[PDB]
Design a protein around this ligand. Structure first.
Ligand SMILES: *[C@@H]1O[C@H](CO)[C@@H](O[C@@H]2O[C@H](CO)[C@@H](O[C@@H]3O[C@H](CO)[C@@H](O)[C@H](O[C@H]4O[C@H](CO)[C@@H](O)[C@H](O)[C@@H]4O)[C@@H]3O)[C@H](O)[C@H]2NC(C)=O)[C@H](O)[C@H]1NC(C)=O
Ligand SMILES: *[C@@H]1O[C@H](CO)[C@@H](O[C@@H]2O[C@H](CO)[C@@H](O[C@@H]3O[C@H](CO)[C@@H](O)[C@H](O)[C@@H]3O)[C@H](O)[C@H]2NC(C)=O)[C@H](O)[C@H]1NC(C)=O
Ligand SMILES: *[C@@H]1O[C@H](CO)[C@@H](O[C@@H]2O[C@H](CO)[C@@H](O[C@@H]3O[C@H](CO)[C@@H](O)[C@H](O)[C@@H]3O)[C@H](O)[C@H]2NC(C)=O)[C@H](O)[C@H]1NC(C)=O
Ligand SMILES: *[C@@H]1O[C@H](CO)[C@@H](O[C@@H]2O[C@H](CO)[C@@H](O)[C@H](O)[C@H]2NC(C)=O)[C@H](O)[C@H]1NC(C)=O
Ligand SMILES: *[C@@H]1O[C@H](CO)[C@@H](O[C@@H]2O[C@H](CO)[C@@H](O)[C@H](O)[C@H]2NC(C)=O)[C@H](O)[C@H]1NC(C)=O
Ligand SMILES: *[C@@H]1O[C@H](CO)[C@@H](O)[C@H](O)[C@H]1NC(C)=O
Ligand SMILES: *[C@]12O[C@H]1[C@H](CO)[C@H](O)[C@H](O)[C@H]2O
Ligand SMILES: *[C@]12O[C@H]1[C@H](CO)[C@H](O)[C@H](O)[C@H]2O
Lengths: 392, 390
């Protein structure tokens, strides 16, 4: 989408995976979808270093809405959970230096059963623009055939444009297309700043594996269409929650950087370990994700429960990820000719290799003819940065 | 097995899950199956508080054997990897006040392809006894019939007894039978100090869940036969490795305690987090696992992606574990009438409840009329101890 936005993958926080559709503010107030939750998340994004690290968008997912539209046909914030309305939350979020994302659905109802945009594409787009909304996530539930899905996604895109406000547009067009026919990524890219391809993540290693395996299986179809203004969206970062071991968390961060994924944390910023925080705020891995070249990486090799992924970076640098998919035993040795990495460019005539994950370690100069030898934890990833050099 | 051993479930360390069949001492001397690995783990069991917490058996699994028996038909330690031999390793382990476990297979080979014990049960038993072995784990691979399987496990049982040496006998008889016919657990217990029921654990939450699901499904057949001298073995603790989140590690420790499971760590004691160490050394939770009554706990309830398990303890105490099996979202609220716990006796007329996991916290006095409310982490467990007020 040529709206001048998302020149790098969008970074922020989204409530869905962690907080879901919790409407019970009486018995579950700390986890219910309320203005107070977003106000508190906003403060902590500023004070706990998240905005500094690049996480800029505070995003509302499903279950912010009143059950019905107002008399004047507009969407309304839930009066009990959002009594001060979207406009004033937008003011609060802007006052902290952050941008505000909101959520709607192309079809008749949102996935959670709240008012769809089946008509109203134009008034809804305008409502968001009046409110101060800086990002829209547009889910695809309750949609009447391919024709409407496509038409709806294309309509809301132009509608947001016609508001003349800068609004990052986040689509699930491809994901809700698969059931009928293969997506057309060139068309989707025209209309959308990023697009969900695959089933909602949850707080599990199984979910990470299934997203990586779908991505690598399908990589010839999706890798090249990604670039500034249009990204593949493999769903939210779930680091800092309950389901992933330290190693599986390193794997998600490493490979979301390889895939030029948007980085939407879905966690509780009020209750997050120092380890998870340091990983999500790792300047060097964020720098790989945010690389201005904006070329998505890919899986180079698979075999013996090992995966090798790499991503081209600006200035003849490469990121390399080595995954151990063996879920038994100890750290496994993996060796590769440095020549085989970065299409033989990265280390011609030399590489300087820095390990970034699981810890940051200068490894030194590798000749084009060198071997790289590493040890990789089960369900973990080693992430390397290769800097092309004349020296040595 | 009435040999006076395993009166509480056996505690220690077993190489298999973390170190497996690593024979590469040239390229990997610090993780190959060698007497140096076992000596290192022994020193740390003493120096790092493992022994003091009750971890007492340092156990060798598969891949310790030379490829061939000796000229006298006996098993031999690999001459390169176990150069001083098993007896001498046993001497060392004993000098630190620990016990040594070793491994054999009821069939013609071990699962990894080394010499099997079929036809050598009596000599193999005497060999182990002579060496000063304090425990045998007896795997079930390369056994052509259920007759040979049963005969082999019983025969080794009687041969161990006849050596005169106190040797804990860990069997896999039910595991290898189950595909073909329902095991008789009354018979297995007469011959075995503990018995593997289910597929080898690995370093995953999938493995944990599948072991718990198998145990809850089969609980009518296995819970009542467990007790001092004979335990269900749901396989090794993998806490301190790579594959489990903190909440999944808590779930393993909590439910191995509810299940009166043997506690065999398979980890690297040289490289283990403070968190993993304090969970595995948690004295209140080990006291539940090690309760002298020896009554295995069971699944009370399952619904809304929650499980409630409980175990009766010495002195009118109960352990209760509440699992959140929902792998999405945040800490979920669960409430149960305390009258529904411990068969109606735990909290009649009242009980004092202490949370043990994920943190120790006194919750206070609960009346027979009361409801316990808890928030449980996705893939996590809340473990409570109930003390009846009388
Ligand atoms: C509604 O849709 C229209 C139709 O596309 C859209 O207009 C386009 O906006 C983009 C973004 O501003 C324009 O692209 C820019 O063009 C100008 C002029 O050539 C350049 O200054 C811009 O350069 C930036 O990006 C460069 C990297 O590519 C940087 O090097 C540089 O520093 C600049 O930051 C950029 O190329 C595009 O020209 C228009 N196209 C048309 C047909 O007008 C409009 O923005 C949409 N409006 C909203 C609010 O959605
Ligand atoms: C070989 O098999 C026999 C028979 O099963 C085992 O005998 C049993 O041994 C236990 C433990 O020594 C006896 O019970 C215990 O006795 C001791 C001392 O008297 C007491 O302190 C305990 O409280 C408990 O009562 C058990 O009764 C006995 N059974 C029989 C029939 O004699 C023997 O231990 C086995 N030997 C080896 C080397 O495994
Ligand atoms: C370990 O290996 C030996 C040798 O391969 C096994 O011994 C063999 O066991 C088979 C049973 O599977 C015997 O075959 C039987 O032969 C009779 C007729 O003789 C036939 O009627 C049966 O139906 C069956 O086919 C075979 O005779 C026997 N061979 C020897 C040398 O004893 C042994 O059983 C293996 N042990 C285990 C536990 O797997
Ligand atoms: C997939 O979508 C792309 C973009 O809509 C299609 O390519 C364009 O099709 C339009 C309308 O037919 C042409 O006017 C353009 O010249 C085409 N290219 C571009 C880059 O805009 C493409 O035909 C669609 N279908 C397939 C099978 O690729
Ligand atoms: C399961 O195995 C047990 C023990 O081998 C069997 O129980 C024995 O039954 C015999 C009768 O054949 C009695 O002599 C013994 O007193 C019992 N032993 C014990 C300690 O109970 C039982 O028969 C087997 N059950 C089935 C269903 O086959
Ligand atoms: C919404 O429902 C109406 C019928 O009430 C139907 O005509 C329309 O196709 C539906 N719209 C979408 C986008 O599914
Ligand atoms: C749409 O299953 C829905 C849900 C909201 O109800 C989330 O937004 C999810 O990410 C999306 O795929
Ligand atoms: C038998 O798969 C084997 C293996 C040794 O080779 C381990 O001892 C495992 O625990 C056991 O079931």
């Amino acid at each position: 989408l040529d709206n001048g936005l998302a020149r790098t993958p969008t970074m922020g926080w989204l409530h869905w995976e962690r907080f879901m559709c919790n409407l019970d503010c009486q018995e579950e107030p700390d986890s219910c979808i309320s203005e107070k939750l977003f106000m508190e998340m906003a403060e902590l994004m500023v004070s706990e270093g998240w905005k500094d690290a690049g996480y800029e968008y505070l995003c509302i997912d499903d279950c912010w809405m009143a059950p019905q539209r107002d008399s004047e046909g507009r969407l309304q914030a839930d009066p009990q959970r959002f009594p001060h309305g979207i406009r004033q939350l937008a003011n609060y979020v802007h006052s902290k230096g952050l941008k505000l994302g909101i959520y709607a659905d192309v079809g008749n109802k949102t996935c959670a059963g709240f008012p769809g945009s089946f008509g109203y594409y134009d008034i809804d787009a305008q409502t968001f623009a009046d409110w101060g909304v800086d990002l829209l996530k547009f889910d695809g539930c309750y949609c009447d055939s391919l024709e409407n899905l496509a038409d709806g996604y294309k309509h809301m895109s132009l509608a947001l444009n016609r508001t003349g406000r800068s609004i990052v547009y986040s689509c699930e067009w491809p994901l809700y297309m698969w059931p009928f026919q293969k997506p057309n990524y060139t068309e989707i890219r025209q209309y959308c700043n990023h697009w969900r391809n695959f089933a909602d993540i949850d707080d599990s290693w199984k979910s990470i594996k299934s997203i990586l395996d779908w991505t690598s299986f399908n990589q010839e179809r999706i890798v090249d269409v990604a670039g500034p203004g249009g990204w593949n969206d493999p769903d939210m970062l779930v680091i800092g929650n309950f389901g992933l071991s330290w190693n599986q968390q390193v794997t998600q961060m490493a490979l979301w950087a390889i895939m030029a994924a948007p980085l939407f944390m879905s966690n509780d910023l009020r209750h997050i370990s120092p380890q998870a925080k340091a990983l999500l705020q790792d300047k060097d891995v964020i720098a790989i994700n945010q690389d201005p070249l904006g070329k998505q990486g890919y899986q180079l090799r698979q075999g013996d429960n090992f995966e090798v992924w790499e991503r081209p970076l600006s200035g003849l640098a490469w990121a390399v990820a080595m995954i151990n998919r063996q879920e038994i035993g100890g750290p496994r040795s993996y060796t590769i000719a440095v020549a085989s990495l970065g299409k033989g460019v990265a280390c011609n005539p030399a590489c300087f290799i820095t390990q970034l994950l699981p810890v940051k370690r200068k490894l030194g100069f590798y000749e084009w003819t060198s071997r790289l030898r590493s040890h990789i934890n089960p369900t973990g990833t080693v992430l390397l940065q290769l800097e092309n050099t004349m020296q040595m």
